[PDB]
Design a protein around this ligand. Structure first.
Ligand SMILES: CCCCC/C=C\C/C=C/CCCCCCCC(=O)O
Lengths: 49, 49
């Protein structure tokens, strides 16, 4: 699985509404409604199939 | 809605449907029913209603 550091961002994620539709989106430790009201420190993306 | 967004019909969710179209309150008493309707609400060429 591929790990990718993420830094110096602004987590808009409204751009994802336009095209991509996600079957599952589960967040642990954070309620998803608050994801706009926060700043994230050590962000890694672990990608695979 | 589409199938992938049925998860968004729930308290405390976010996404297209849960922010721009239909929002449920946190202190929600009641319940949600959803069923696939491909043989009714989808036609060849695609319903755009
Ligand atoms: C560059 C990758 C992301 C870096 C930021 C990481 C985490 C914070 C942003 C979190 C939101 C993840 C996308 C959720 C999209 C809405 C899904 C939906 O409601 O249908």
């Amino acid at each position: 699985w591929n790990r990718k550091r993420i830094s110096n961002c602004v987590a808009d994620y409204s751009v994802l509404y336009n095209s991509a539709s996600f079957s599952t989106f589960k967040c642990y430790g954070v309620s998803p409604t608050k994801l706009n009201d926060l700043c994230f420190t050590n962000v890694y993306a672990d990608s695979f199939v | 809605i589409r199938g992938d967004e049925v998860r968004q019909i729930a308290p405390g969710q976010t996404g297209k449907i849960a922010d721009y179209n239909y929002k449920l309150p946190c202190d929600f008493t009641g319940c949600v029913i959803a069923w696939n309707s491909n043989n009714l609400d989808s036609k060849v060429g695609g319903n755009y209603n």
